[PDB]
Amino acid sequence: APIKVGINGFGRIGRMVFQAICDQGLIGTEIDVVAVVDMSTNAEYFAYQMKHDTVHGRPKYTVEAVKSSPSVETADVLVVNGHRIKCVKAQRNPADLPWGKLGVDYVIESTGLFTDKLKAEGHIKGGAKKVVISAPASGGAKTIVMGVNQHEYSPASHHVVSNASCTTNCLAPIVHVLTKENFGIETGLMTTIHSYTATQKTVDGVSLKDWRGGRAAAVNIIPSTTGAAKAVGMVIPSTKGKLTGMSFRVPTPDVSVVDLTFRATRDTSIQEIDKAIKKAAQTYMKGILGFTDEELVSADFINDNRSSVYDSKATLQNNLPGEKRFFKVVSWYDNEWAYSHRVVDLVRYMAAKDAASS
Amino acid sequence: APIKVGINGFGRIGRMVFQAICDQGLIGTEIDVVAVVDMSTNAEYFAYQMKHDTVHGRPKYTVEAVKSSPSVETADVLVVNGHRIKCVKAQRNPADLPWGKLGVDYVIESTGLFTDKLKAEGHIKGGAKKVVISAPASGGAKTIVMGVNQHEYSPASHHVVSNASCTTNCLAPIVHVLTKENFGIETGLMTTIHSYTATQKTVDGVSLKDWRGGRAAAVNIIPSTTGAAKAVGMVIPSTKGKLTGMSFRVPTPDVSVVDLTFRATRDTSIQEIDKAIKKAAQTYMKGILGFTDEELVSADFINDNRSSVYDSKATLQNNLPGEKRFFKVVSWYDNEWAYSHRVVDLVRYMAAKDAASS
Amino acid sequence: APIKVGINGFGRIGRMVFQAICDQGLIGTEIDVVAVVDMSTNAEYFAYQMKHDTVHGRPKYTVEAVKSSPSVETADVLVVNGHRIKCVKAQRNPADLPWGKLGVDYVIESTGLFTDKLKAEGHIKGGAKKVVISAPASGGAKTIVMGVNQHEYSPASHHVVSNASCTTNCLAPIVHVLTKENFGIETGLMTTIHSYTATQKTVDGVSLKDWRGGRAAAVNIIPSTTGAAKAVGMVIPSTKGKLTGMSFRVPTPDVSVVDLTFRATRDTSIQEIDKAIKKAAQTYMKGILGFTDEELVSADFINDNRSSVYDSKATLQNNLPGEKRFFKVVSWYDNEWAYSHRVVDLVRYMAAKDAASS
Amino acid sequence: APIKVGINGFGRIGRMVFQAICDQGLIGTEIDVVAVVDMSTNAEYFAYQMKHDTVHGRPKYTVEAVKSSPSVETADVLVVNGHRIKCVKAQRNPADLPWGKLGVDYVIESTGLFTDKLKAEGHIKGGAKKVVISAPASGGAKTIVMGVNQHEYSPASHHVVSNASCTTNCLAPIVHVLTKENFGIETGLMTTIHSYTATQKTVDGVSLKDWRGGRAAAVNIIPSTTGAAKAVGMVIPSTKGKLTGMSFRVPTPDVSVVDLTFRATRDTSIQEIDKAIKKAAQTYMKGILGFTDEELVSADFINDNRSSVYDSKATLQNNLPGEKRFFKVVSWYDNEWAYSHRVVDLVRYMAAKDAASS
Numbered sequence A, B, C, D: 001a002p003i004k005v006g007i008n009g010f011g012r013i014g015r016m017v018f019q020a021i022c023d024q025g026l027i028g029t030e031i032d033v034v035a036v037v038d039m040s041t042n043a044e045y046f047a048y049q050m051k052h053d054t055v056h057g058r059p060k061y062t063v064e065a066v067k068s069s070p071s072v073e074t075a076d077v078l079v080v081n082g083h084r085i086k087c088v089k090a091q092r093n094p095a096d097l098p099w100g101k102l103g104v105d106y107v108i109e110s111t112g113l114f115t116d117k118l119k120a121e122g123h124i125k126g127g128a129k130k131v132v133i134s135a136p137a138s139g140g141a142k143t144i145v146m147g148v149n150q151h152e153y154s155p156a157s158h159h160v161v162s163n164a165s166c167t168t169n170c171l172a173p174i175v176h177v178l179t180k181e182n183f184g185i186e187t188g189l190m191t192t193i194h195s196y197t198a199t200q201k202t203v204d205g206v207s208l209k210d211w212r213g214g215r216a217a218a219v220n221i222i223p224s225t226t227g228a229a230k231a232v233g234m235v236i237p238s239t240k241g242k243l244t245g246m247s248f249r250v251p252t253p254d255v256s257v258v259d260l261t262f263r264a265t266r267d268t269s270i271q272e273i274d275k276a277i278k279k280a281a282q283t284y285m286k287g288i289l290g291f292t293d294e295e296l297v298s299a300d301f302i303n304d305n306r307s308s309v310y311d312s313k314a315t316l317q318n319n320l321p322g323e324k325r326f327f328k329v330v331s332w333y334d335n336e337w338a339y340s341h342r343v344v345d346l347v348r349y350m351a352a353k354d355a356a357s358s
C-alpha cells in the first residue's frame, strides 16, 4: 500500500526529499505525499520553488498549482505527476497539524524547529503514527544512519526516529567499515569543510547561539560546529567518547568534505585502508558509501546520492609514507541531495518493519 | 546641548550610524546615544558585533560591556569612549519602548519593521519627540535627501522623517544638479547593480513578497527592485512620473553602482554634463556628491561617505559620440556607509531647526 | 558528407562547441571533429576537462584517451562516442598547423589569440578552406549573427567569418525584431551585467589593456566593456552609430543579462513590444530568441541554448506607465552555452552554402 | 647604511613586501628599494596597482609615476615618499637583470618562476650579493622560518635563502613551541583551509601540473597541496618524515587557517598546550606567533602581520575531553601580509649577519 507521508517544512531538505521521491518514481504508488506544510499555502509559490533550483536545477517531474474550490483565491493544491498534494498552513505546534484527519502516517519533520523528541511527538498527538526528524534529535529519540544501524529500528519502541545529520551520514559509514574491517579506531578527531546553509547570514547579523555563525557567510571562513560530533556515537556506541570534531563553513552553496584523522588499534597501511573502503563500497555499503579515483573538486559531487564518497587520490597522496597508525581519510558528500535520499530510504524501511509489526 | 538619541535595530545601518557618530567625534558631546535596541540585551554580543565587521573592519573607538547592578548576569551597558549606553530589550510595538523615561528625544528607526509613518509614530507615543526612518517610509512621512531638500524640513509639521534609501541618496544628488544646471530631464530609466543585503537568503529559501529575491544571494544575478524608484519623486517633485528604475542584486557584500539613462530637455553634450557634475561636486554638493577620474572598481569605494561618487571615465567613455540628448551617467556609493553618514547629518540638522522652533 | 572540422583552443568555448556537437548527435555523421588543439596533447587531461565541468556538469557523450602507437608515452587521441580525435600540439602561428594534411576544411578559431582576419587567414595557409572566429574579429572579417544575417554569407568572398560575441548574439536578435516589427530605434545605450571569464584575475594582477579588468574578479563589480558595442552595427548596418554601451563584470561564473534602453521612432507601448518579441520568438526567431514569463534568476538560464531569452516580467514591470518612446528591454543568455551552439550552427550553415558553391 | 634591495616580480607578494617596507618606515633610510621588476615598466600602471588593493585597501605611503628623461613616453620611475625607484623591464633569465649595475645587493625573488636555487643564482651572476626566494626553493637552498631558525643563516655558505611558504610560516612556529616546551610530536597530519591565489583560475581552465587546481577558483572547494608539507622538516629536522599534510582551497581572496592534528610523546592536556602557546606568544615568539581568545572569522585576520595566530576558543572547544595524546590546534594567518612581513624581516636580519661577516 502507498506509504502515507507528509512534509513539515518545505525547505532545502523538505524539497529535496520530495524530489527524491518523485525522481525515483516512488511518488503516487510506493510512497504517497499527502500534504506539504510551510509559511504560505500558495501552491503557486511552491510550484515556483520546485521548478527552479539554484544548485540542483529543474526537477525531472512536472508540477502545477490548482485551487480546489473556485472560492479560494490562491491555489492550494500541487499536482505533481498526476497526484494532488495539499498545501497545509504552518502551525507553531506540531500537535495542531491535521495529520490524522488528512490520513498521514509518516510525518517528515524538516522545519528544523522541533529537533526535540518531545516537541516532535506532537505529530503523533496530531494523529500520526511515526515521525522522522531530518536532523540530530534531542530528548533521546532513535538515531539511525542508513547502512550502519537501520536494523536496530524497533516498530514497537521507536516512533520518533532521527536520521542524524549530513556530516554524520558521511562519517558514520566510514567509521563503520573501519571497525568492521578490523582496523579499529583508538582516538579520532575530524574536521568538515562545509558549504553554508539556510541558518547563516548573507551579511553580519544576529546569531545569539553561535557568535561566529552570524557573520557574512559567503565572505569568510567561519569555524563552527558539527552535529556529527555527537550523533556519531549514538549510531556506533563503540566510538562514544573516542571521536570528536569541528566544521569550517566556507563560501560554497552546496557540497561538503569530511577530513578525518585517526589512530588505528593495530598496525596497518593506507593502501590497506584504501583497499578495504573500495571493497566495502562495492559490497555491503553499496549505494551508501562510494569512492573516487579521479581528481574531483566540490562541484563534481552535486546531485550525487551516495551518503559519503571517499576520495582515493586525496587520501593516498596525503598520508605519511612510513606509517602504520596515524591516518587521514578524505570523503565528500552533497549535503542536501544524499542526506535527502537517505530520509526517503529510512521512511520506506521503517514502513517495511511497520508492516511486519506496528 | 547633547542631542538625545536612541537606535532601534542595531543592524548594518544601525551599527554604521552609531559608528559614524563615534568616528566623527560627535559621541558624548555633540550627540548623545542613550540606548541601543535589539533582539538581545547582551552588551557582550553587541561589543563583539562592534569590534569586528567583515566589510568595514574594526571601528576607531573603544567599546566595553559592563553589567550595571552586579545582580544581572549578562552585561547590559556599552561603554564607548567613556560613555554609558543602555541595552534595551526589543519590543513588538514601538510605543512600548521607554523612550520618554530614558530621556530620548530623537529615535532612529532601523529595524526595517516599521517603515510606516503610523507604525513609526509609536516612538512619539513612547515618549520621543522626533523619529528618523532609515528607509523609504510609508503613510506619507517626510522624505528628505540631504543636499537636495533638507531645508524643506518643518520642526512643527514634520515629526516622522524618512532619509530615503541608499539608491535614492545616490540618484537624487545627480538628478538635482542635472535640473539645477538647466540640462533638464525629460524621461529617464535607471538600473542599479546592487550588493546583497540582510534581507536576502544564502540559499534558495522563502521570500513571499519578491519571488526572485529569495534565491541564493551570493550565487545569482537577481533582478529585483529599488526604493529610489518611488522616493526620488518625493524629494524632487519635478521628476514625479518622469523617472523609474530597477536593480540587479549581485554577489558582493557592499558598495553599489547607479547606471542612469535619460533624455535632456535641451541639446547638450556629455562633456558639458561631466564638467557640471565636477563643478557641482566642488561647490554646492561638496560632501554629498563627489567624483572620480580614476579607473576604480567596487572595492575601492568601501568606507567612502559621499552619498554619490560620479564615475568620470566610465561615463565619458560609454556615451554616443554624436549626441546631444540621450545620455548615461554612472555613479557609485557605499550603501551602508555613506547612507549611515547621511542619517547622522539629518538628525543633527533636524536638531538645529528644532532648537530654533520645536 | 561529414563536415571536416578542427578546433583551435580547447577552452570554455572550445569545449562547449565540441559538446554541442556531441550532444545534438552531430558527431561522427553530420559533423566530423578531426583534431583539437591546445597547450598540451595529453588526451588524458583533455578527457578530464571534458568529463567534469564546474558550471555545466558532465556531458552526455563518453570520452576516452588512447595513445596511438604504443611508442608514445602519453595518450594522444580522444575517443568520443566511437570516433578517433587527434590531439594536435599548439602552434604560435595558425599557418604552422597541419590542417590540410589532417583533412580539416573548417577551422574553429577559439584560442582568443587570433581575432584578426589576417592572423586567422593562416589556417587557410595551413591547408584549411574556411575559418570561423569565436569572437569579434578585426581586419574586416565577415561578422554574422545567426538569425539576423547569416544569409549574407558569401561562399566565394567570405572565407574568414566571425560569429560576433556572446553579448552581440543576445542584443542583435532583439534589435532585429525591433526594426523588422517597425518600432524602430532612434538612439540606444545598453549595459550588460556579465559573468566573469577566463581573461579576468582571481586576485589583483596584471591587465595592461584594461586597468579595471585586472582586479579580483569574484569580489568586485568591475566596469568594463563589451564586444557587442561595435559588432552590433556590423550585422545591422541600420544601427551603426545609433547604439553603444558598456558592461559590468560581476561575481558569477556564467550567465549574463542585457539591459537595453532605447528611444523608438514611432509612438508605441511596452505591451506592444512585449507582444511582438513573444510573437517573433514563436515565429521567425524560434530557437534563437526565446522569452520567459517566469520570475527567474541567473542560475535558471544555465544550459539554455537560445541566443537571447527576453524577460517579460522584468521588462513589463520596469518601464514608465505613461510612455510611448523611452523603453527598457531586459534579456538573459548563457554566454558559453548559447553562443557555442550558434558557432556549430554557423559552421553547418556555411557548409550548406559551400556545397552549393565553394 | 641603507640595504640595497630590488624586487623581481611585483605581484601580490611583491607589492605587499614593498608595502611592509614603506609602512614600517624603513623605506629610504633603513632599507633602500632601488628598482622593481615586472612585465611592463609603466610606472603609471604600477602607481595604480599600488594605490588601490581589493583586499588590503590603500597603502599608507604616497606614490607617483614620473618619466626620467622627457624623451621616454611612459613614466618609468616611482616616487614613493620622496625616493626614486626604477621600473626595470622583465627578463626571461635572472642573470640578465642589471643588478650589479643598479647597485642592488639583495634581490627578492617573487615572480614565482625561479624557485630553483640554480635558476635564482642568476641574480648573483647578474651582479647581486644575496637572494631571498619568497617561496619554498628547490635545488637545496637554505630554508629559514623567522622565529624558528634564522640564526642558522651563514653569511658565508648561504647566498640563496628561501623564506618558506605562507602555511610553513604558520605551522613552523607552532611545531617549534610544541617541541621546545617538551610536548613533543610523535606523528602528525595537517590540513590548511586556504584562500585561492594568483595561480588559480576564475573559470575551468588549464593547469597541467595539478589537475584539480585548474577548476573555477571561487566556486569550488579544491583539494590541493601545500608547500609547508615538505618545508617544515627543512627548518625543524626533528619533524622530517613525522609530519605531512594537504590544503583545501576555498572561495576566499585572503586569510587562511591551519588545522593541525598530532600525537604527543608524553601524556598532557589541551589546557597545558593552550597555556604554553599563549605563554610562548608573550615571550620568545612575540611578533611571530600571536593568539586570540575571541570568536573571530577569516576577515578578522586581514592585515594581521603575525606569522601564525593561534585560536584559543576553536582549539579548546574542539578536542576530546578525556585526552592526553591526540590533539588538534587551529591557527590563522594572513597569507599575503604576514608572510611579506617575514620577508622584510629576513632581509634586514640577513643584512645584519652580512655586515658582521660577508
Ligand SMILES: NC(=O)c1ccc[n+]([C@@H]2O[C@H](COP(=O)([O-])OP(=O)(O)OC[C@H]3O[C@@H](n4cnc5c(N)ncnc54)[C@H](O)[C@@H]3O)[C@@H](O)[C@H]2O)c1
Pocket (backbone or CB within 6 Å): A008, A009, A010, A011, A012, A013, A014, A037, A038, A039, A090, A091, A092, A110, A111, A112, A113, A134, A135, A165, A166, A197, A198, A199, A335, A336, A339, B204, B205, B206
Ligand atoms: N541543508 C543541509 O545541508 C541539511 C542537511 C541535512 C539536514 N538538514 C537539517 O534539516 C533541517 C532542515 O533545514 P534546511 O537547511 O532545509 O532549512 P530551510 O530553511 O530550507 O528549511 C526549513 C523550512 O521550514 C519552514 N518552516 C519554519 N517554521 C515552520 C513551521 N512552523 N511549520 C512548517 N514549516 C516551517 C521554513 O520556511 C523553511 O522553508 C535543519 O535542521 C537542518 O539542519 C540540513
Ligand SMILES: NC(=O)c1ccc[n+]([C@@H]2O[C@H](COP(=O)([O-])OP(=O)(O)OC[C@H]3O[C@@H](n4cnc5c(N)ncnc54)[C@H](O)[C@@H]3O)[C@@H](O)[C@H]2O)c1
Pocket (backbone or CB within 6 Å): A205, A206, B008, B009, B010, B011, B012, B013, B014, B037, B038, B039, B090, B091, B092, B110, B111, B112, B113, B115, B134, B135, B136, B165, B166, B197, B198, B199, B335, B336, B339
Ligand atoms: N544596508 C543597506 O544597504 C541599507 C541602506 C539604506 C537603508 N537601509 C534600511 O534600513 C533598514 C535596515 O537595513 P539593515 O541592513 O540594518 O538590516 P538588518 O537586518 O541589519 O537590521 C535589522 C536589525 O534590527 C533587529 N530587529 C528586528 N526587529 C527588531 C525589533 N522589533 N526591535 C529591535 N530590533 C529589531 C534585527 O535583529 C537586526 O538587528 C531597512 O529599512 C533598510 O532598507 C539599509
Ligand SMILES: NC(=O)c1ccc[n+]([C@@H]2O[C@H](COP(=O)([O-])OP(=O)(O)OC[C@H]3O[C@@H](n4cnc5c(N)ncnc54)[C@H](O)[C@@H]3O)[C@@H](O)[C@H]2O)c1
Pocket (backbone or CB within 6 Å): C008, C009, C010, C011, C012, C013, C014, C037, C038, C039, C090, C091, C092, C110, C111, C112, C113, C134, C135, C165, C166, C197, C198, C199, C335, C336, C339, D204, D205, D206
Ligand atoms: N566564455 C565566454 O564568455 C565567451 C563567449 C563568447 C565568445 N568568447 C570568445 O571565445 C574565445 C574562447 O574564449 P574562452 O573564454 O573559451 O577562453 P579559454 O581561455 O578557456 O580558451 C582559450 C584556450 O585557448 C588555448 N590556447 C591559447 N593559445 C593557444 C594556441 N596557440 N594554440 C592552441 N590553443 C591555445 C588556451 O591554452 C586555452 O585553453 C575568446 O576569444 C572569447 O572572447 C568567449
Ligand SMILES: NC(=O)c1ccc[n+]([C@@H]2O[C@H](COP(=O)([O-])OP(=O)(O)OC[C@H]3O[C@@H](n4cnc5c(N)ncnc54)[C@H](O)[C@@H]3O)[C@@H](O)[C@H]2O)c1
Pocket (backbone or CB within 6 Å): C204, C205, C206, D008, D009, D010, D011, D012, D013, D014, D037, D038, D039, D090, D091, D092, D110, D111, D112, D113, D134, D135, D164, D165, D166, D197, D198, D335, D336, D339
Ligand atoms: N600569495 C600567497 O599566498 C603567497 C604566500 C607565500 C609565498 N608566496 C609566493 O609569492 C610567489 C609569487 O606569487 P604572488 O602571490 O605574488 O603572485 P603574482 O602572480 O601576483 O606575483 C608574481 C608576479 O611576478 C610577475 N612576473 C612573472 N614573471 C616574471 C618574470 N619572468 N619577470 C619579472 N616579473 C615577473 C608577474 O607579472 C606577477 O605580477 C609565489 O611563489 C608564492 O608561493 C605567495
